[PDB]
Design a protein around this ligand. Sequence first.
Ligand SMILES: *[C@@]([C])([C][O])[C@](*)(=O)[C]([C]C1=[C][C]=[C][C]=[C]1)[N]C(=O)[C]([C]C1=[C][N]C2=C1[C]=[C][C]=[C]2)[N]C(=O)[C]([C])[N]C(=O)C1=C([C])C2=C([C]1)[C]=[C][C]=[C]2
Ligand SMILES: [Mg+2]
Ligand SMILES: [Mg+2]
Ligand SMILES: [Mg+2]
Ligand SMILES: [Mg+2]
Ligand SMILES: [Mg+2]
Ligand SMILES: [Mg+2]
Lengths: 204, 196, 196, 222, 195, 195, 233, 226, 211
Amino acid sequence: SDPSSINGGIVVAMTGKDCVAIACDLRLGSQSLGVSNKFEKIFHYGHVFLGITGLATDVTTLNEMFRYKTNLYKLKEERAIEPETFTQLVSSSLYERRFGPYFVGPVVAGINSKSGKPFIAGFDLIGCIDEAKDFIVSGTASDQLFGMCESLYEPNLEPEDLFETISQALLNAADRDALSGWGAVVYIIKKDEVVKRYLKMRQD
Amino acid sequence: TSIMAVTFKDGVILGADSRTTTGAYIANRVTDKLTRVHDKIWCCRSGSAADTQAIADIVQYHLELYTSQYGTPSTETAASVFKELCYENKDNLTAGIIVAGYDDKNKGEVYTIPLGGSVHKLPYAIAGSGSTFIYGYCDKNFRENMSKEETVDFIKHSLSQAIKWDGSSGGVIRMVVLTAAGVERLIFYPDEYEQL
Amino acid sequence: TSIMAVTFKDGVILGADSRTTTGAYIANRVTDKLTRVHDKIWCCRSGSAADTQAIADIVQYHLELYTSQYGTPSTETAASVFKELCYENKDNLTAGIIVAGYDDKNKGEVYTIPLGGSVHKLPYAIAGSGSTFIYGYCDKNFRENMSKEETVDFIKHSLSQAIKWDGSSGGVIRMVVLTAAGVERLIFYPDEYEQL
Amino acid sequence: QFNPYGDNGGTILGIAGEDFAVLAGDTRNITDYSINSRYEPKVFDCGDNIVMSANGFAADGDALVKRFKNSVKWYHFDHNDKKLSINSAARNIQHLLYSRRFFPYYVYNIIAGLDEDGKGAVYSFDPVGSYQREQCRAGGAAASLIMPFLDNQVNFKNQYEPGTNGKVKKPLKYLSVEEVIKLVRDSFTSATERHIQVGDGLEILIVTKDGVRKEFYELKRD
Amino acid sequence: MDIILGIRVQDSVILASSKAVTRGISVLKDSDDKTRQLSPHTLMSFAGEAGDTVQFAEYIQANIQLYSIREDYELSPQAVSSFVRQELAKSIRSRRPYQVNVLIGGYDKKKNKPELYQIDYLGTKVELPYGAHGYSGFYTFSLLDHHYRPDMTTEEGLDLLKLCVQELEKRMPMDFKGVIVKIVDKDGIRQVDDF
Amino acid sequence: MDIILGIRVQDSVILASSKAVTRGISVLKDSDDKTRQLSPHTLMSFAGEAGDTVQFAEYIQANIQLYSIREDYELSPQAVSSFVRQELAKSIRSRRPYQVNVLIGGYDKKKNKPELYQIDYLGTKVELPYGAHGYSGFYTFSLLDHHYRPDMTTEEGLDLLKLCVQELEKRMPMDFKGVIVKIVDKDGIRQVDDF
Amino acid sequence: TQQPIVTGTSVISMKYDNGVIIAADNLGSYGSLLRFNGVERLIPVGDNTVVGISGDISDMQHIERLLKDLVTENAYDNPLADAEEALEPSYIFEYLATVMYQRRSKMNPLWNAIIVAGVQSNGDQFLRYVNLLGVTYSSPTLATGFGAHMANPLLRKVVDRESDIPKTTVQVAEEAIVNAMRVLYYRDARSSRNFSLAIIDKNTGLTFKKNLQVENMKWDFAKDIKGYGTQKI
Amino acid sequence: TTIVGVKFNNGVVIAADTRSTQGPIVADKNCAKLHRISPKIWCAGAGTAADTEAVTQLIGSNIELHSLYTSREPRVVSALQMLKQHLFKYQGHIGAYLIVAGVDPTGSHLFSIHAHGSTDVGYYLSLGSGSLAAMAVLESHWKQDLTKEEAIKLASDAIQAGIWNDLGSGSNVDVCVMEIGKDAEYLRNYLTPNVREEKQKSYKFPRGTTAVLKESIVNICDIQEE
Amino acid sequence: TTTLAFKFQHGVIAAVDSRASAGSYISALRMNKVIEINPYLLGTMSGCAADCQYWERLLAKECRLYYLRNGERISVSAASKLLSNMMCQYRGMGLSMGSMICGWDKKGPGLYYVDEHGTRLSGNMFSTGSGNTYAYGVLDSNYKWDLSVEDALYLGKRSILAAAHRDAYSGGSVNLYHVTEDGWIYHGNHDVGELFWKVKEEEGSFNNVIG
Ligand SMILES: *[C@@]([C])([C][O])[C@](*)(=O)[C]([C]C1=[C][C]=[C][C]=[C]1)[N]C(=O)[C]([C]C1=[C][N]C2=C1[C]=[C][C]=[C]2)[N]C(=O)[C]([C])[N]C(=O)C1=C([C])C2=C([C]1)[C]=[C][C]=[C]2
Ligand SMILES: [Mg+2]
Ligand SMILES: [Mg+2]
Ligand SMILES: [Mg+2]
Ligand SMILES: [Mg+2]
Ligand SMILES: [Mg+2]
Ligand SMILES: [Mg+2]
């Protein structure tokens, strides 16, 4: 019944030294029933990454909407949108449905192409921004992720170290959540290279 | 309902209106709400008439039995019996009772027992739906050690105002005077108290 | 809330307490409930603060526009604007307003507008949760054509009792005097009115 | 309508070593958004080298502990001062809990001690009496924050040995008391940060063959 | 309606849909075809609330047929599935949503690949090798998880489908009156008349 | 449980009862015998809420078996049916009633007559030539009203019963997994193993 | 199950170096009506304990009687009733806590919040809370109802932890309590100006102060406040 | 949340804590609750966080356009009037509870605003779950004719009361001082009394600990030439 | 949960998962859902964990008392009936308990399904819990009476795996039991995480899943 927990799923993002990481599980379900193990929840518009948890129809719908809006932004501005700007766009777009909201928990991740500064942000379903320095969490295992991230995280981690930290935070949180898991993906993001890694995890 | 009990120099006076309603219909316009539980211990009843009649009847029974064994009971003792009934059966009762009596030792005493079954000893007490409208008047005009005539006027004026504003209150004003001299019943009709 | 407006020989006086509650918490203990809609037309507000502020602001706007076109409006006209808002939006409002003003022709006038949006012209009016406790006192002590000092004492004593019994009422007593002489604001602190 | 239950917050944590056991809990007591006490002990030495904590609704938790302590007392009277083993205590507590199957003790209970072979033991319960022996368990408000961390750092879950790439797991080496206390302090420090009902103080009870020892550590008071 | 199944094999997509229609306590029909051809190489099966299902399917059919005539070109199964999803996602926030779940089986003539899309009434789209709606998956997915290969023939796909229906017929309380099976491949859409 | 039928012919009573048992969305058993022998010439079938049915039937069975031993005598079907009715009428005003509907088929050895009694969970008893409980009668009574004669043979009774089950299997939405048929006559109770 | 009718508001308390202080106003409210103005909600038990009660007054009067009867019963066949075997604060509290938890377990609670303040035989300070649910806790400062939200913050600035208790004098503690009572009068709509205060000291014993008033109140700044936004007159 | 507003001699100061929560969980430990409507008009909000932001940015936008239209510096009564009329229109469905403070050519101002559209005036105010803890401090220590330094102290002490005693409030103290004839000074993290202590252990993993199935380069660049 | 049990030529197989849930939160990864009532009697657990543990351990008390009074092991039929009678006393009081009583007695191997409604069913194959539908799918298509002990153990193991994969409230590990006329034999704890990848490779199943 609760739209934010019908399909299940989780997203987590972390900052490091001159890098950011964002990761998600691959499960899509109908409550107890597992339907897909290939439902990726992370999208990118240029070099800005967006992870979305919650109701799958709204996840799909919002991706298509922000693809729409960022493609027009780029045609008019003659440049790719930056994370700080995209974050405001997400917040604006969600609040315009204040009394009929998308049931989602979005997470922005990326590096400013000009300043080189790593950036992450989170929102509630209605657009309130959470601009944290350390990490952002979202999904049905958000409590589990908060506990893992708060204990495992330390600032100024290198890309290959940050990978291990975010992977372990996600994996162990997902293994304590019935509605998350069935595979996982981690994006490691640097100023001019992005690596994508599929994790091996228990399939129950 | 508008009921009150007031202590004064020579003892205590109970006062009440005479209206009983079933919604907006006046089922009885000459009700006697001043009820006797002992020779010189009377009570004013408010709330469910069934509940308050049942209680006062049980109290009257207890005090009659007390008297047979231990002699004349105190006003405090009577209030304790009311309380014990109102408190232990608070889930199934809707009763707001004022207890008033005269001793030669303790003189005039007034106890009020609201819904929950708590007891409060006071110089004077007011209760019933019409009491709300005279809290200010009674507080401003009450004095300790008034004369009988002063106290009768105080109750008459007070209940006159309660009747004037409360639709659930009305009819005649009944009063019972409790002194060493005995027990005096009084009555005051609309044409008397309305023009005050 | 405890609010009242009283006419007298030289004009009219509005009075109010200063307590605003959110349940049992006192959100504001120095509220100003005496609000101006025109130079010498003021109102006392009761009910939803949001609703009564929104209304009085709209009324102030209408009377400012009236004045620009047709000259100084009557107190009756101001009460009609309040009424029209309170009556037509009665399903979505919880407002109990007392309107009071001074003309040189009509002198001091008082109108009360309870929940439904009806209008009642009166010599004096009381409203708010604390008014219930002083219906009897105010009815007994009000006279027509009182002096300014008599009227101030009447309001002070009345609201003192309302504050004393009503938990939703309290703080300071604010008053606004409306006469030909002008507009005088008054204030009375607890140490003054509590000992009455 | 009268609600007979309440929530006094708090969080508890039990870890079993090779020859020891720990039972920790924060000392904060709360209702809604207010603090009742910054130091209200939650973990108790119940006798016979057994420690216990009933977390959730404090009134029910205090009643259960009080009843079990009493059960230990009567076990000595009835059975010639025989030592109540940890497995026997656990089974006894199941029956105390299920006596109220239709008006439950609203608590998550954990006990810790040593088994009859001298090895560290932790037993965990649900509010109605289902219990089982475990190596690691967090209970209470921040249980969902802490448990995954313990799966990772105590049982080395999702951890593999470098170079093999997921073919060979991390071996399950036992933990010392010094290493366990670090995980406990870090668990509660992390929970204090992200959970509003956790903080003020941390009290740890360590159980060895030598007896029951206490350690106290301050936590953030916001 | 009740049960709709779908499976994507090597060179085709197979859709199986129940034949029963019930009003009150009476089965009014035991030969109902819960499907519409959207285009020569795209088939959509459907299940949900009474009336809404057919109305929605026919509305989609009309829109795709309109596109085909306008452009003289068949839309890809992916394009059709996205169009259908948007209509359902649009519908879920309407005054009265259309309570319809669909499977879209199509053969992409450009890529020479069969494609199966599962879309529920909320507008939740997923591409799958095999799919179902409602309770159908609870009984059948364990068999499909076990037996399914991507290089299966159409005949092997039908045999695995028979096993799924047999399991449904054994463990489901409801009598769905068998299934109509249709195959979608490079040559178009055809019905298996004996099943 | 679901469907229980009964028919009284010339010289016997025939009871047909479904084989299905369902918990949640899964059919746990397709060979369940919803009946108990109360005495050598008295059979009771039953249907109602889970658990209550068997508990009630076995409780009745124990009471009749106790009577048989005590008196060394078989109670008449009428006497047994009255005993059962009273227990249900007693039950309906209890704290938690037993939600069980029954058919009692018996052969009265004294009168040399078959007898069928229908009793619902309220304690509503009726003697009938043919009977059913729940929705079963909605489908079958029209056939029985048409074809039934009182001088029918046991074989004709079974053929008419087959027609009733075929109608149920066609028009009922639920799959009740066929029926177990039992015949009660002068020689006692026997089961028709092929139906 | 019931609902409270006539109620008493906050009870506040704190520990200091040689004992405990407890305070509560003298009001008995009937919903929003300030009905009864002479209600004592601090009830001494012997010369070493004071029980402060908030919530339902009829249930308070019942508890008041249980305590009076407890003293009577303790004196029975007890030559040391005014010495070694006198009632201790810890005994009185545990009795009440037992009663409260039993009544909630029968779904017929005493609709109260109680603070038991006193000094034990060994001179140790006793301060413990119990309510209608049978929930118990202890702290250097304790307060019921609104006092929990407004008084505790002020009293915790004086005694923030256990180690601040020996550093806190009776003059400082009393001053903090009296200030807290003033703040409650400003901000609690079901409070009164009149209140009672009790000090239990291990040296000077039990001091029970009646008919105290909130004084030194700030109201003058109200004259300057006009309107609700834009009004100037 | 704990927020306060305090008037003084030549201006007004507001302050807030820095904890944001989603239930009993702390989402952000260093949230910025002090928002800007105009350069010298700042507000702070409790309740629904998205509503307090949206309504603040909306009115701030309209205030800026108004200021440009009238060639005048924005007034606090304008922000107040625009906010309450907006909130009243949505009948409390926009859960914005704000303390609004600022300086303008008329002088210094301090208002509170509730979600249904009611406004209040005061010399000292408090809002949020920690409002009672803060108000106890304000009622104890506030006086007439405060100085700038006394008012900042009173304000931050009031916020601290909320931090320590209210579970909905915590972490740091933000302050903004608006003095007449001066630029407003925003003091982000004016106080930092809740720094996390050093952890006992480092949880940095050995490289290779996590099992991996597939690696791939993600193309974030546009389509290339040649 | 997911549990199953079935009779076959060489006795009865019993297989269960080990997960426990409190909403979406996985409260336990490794719970024993089998009770060893006696050397020839087993009991599976599904539903309220507390109810399952209390009543099945109370059954074991009552089954032990039977042996002492009669000098003979209780039958599977009688044991299942005692349990179903316990359920009938707390009829409508809110218990939640689904169990299979597995064992070997004089009639040979025995298997009974019992639930909180007092239902008692005899049969060759049963499966209970949130993931029973997934297990039935594998069982029904692969079950025979002529199964070897090795193949039968694998079937029950593979059937739980199917459920653990699809059902969100089933998983953790698999516990296997084989009941013979010499008593039950425990065939170990099998982590689903490791078992899944192993079965995927060796069997070729779960082709859709990537690994
Ligand atoms: C499936 C995992 C879930 O349906 C299975 O049914 C298990 C069966 C099981 C049997 C024996 C032992 C353990 C599990 N059921 C549960 O896990 C039940 C499901 C359930 C939750 N609420 C509920 C259920 C069933 C029927 C009515 C209501 N889950 C539980 O019993 C929950 C309450 N228990 C726990 O989360 C905890 C357990 C057990 C446990 C905890 C928590 C802590 C310490 C020890 C044990
Ligand atoms: Mg999982
Ligand atoms: Mg699973
Ligand atoms: Mg307006
Ligand atoms: Mg007052
Ligand atoms: Mg904390
Ligand atoms: Mg879908």
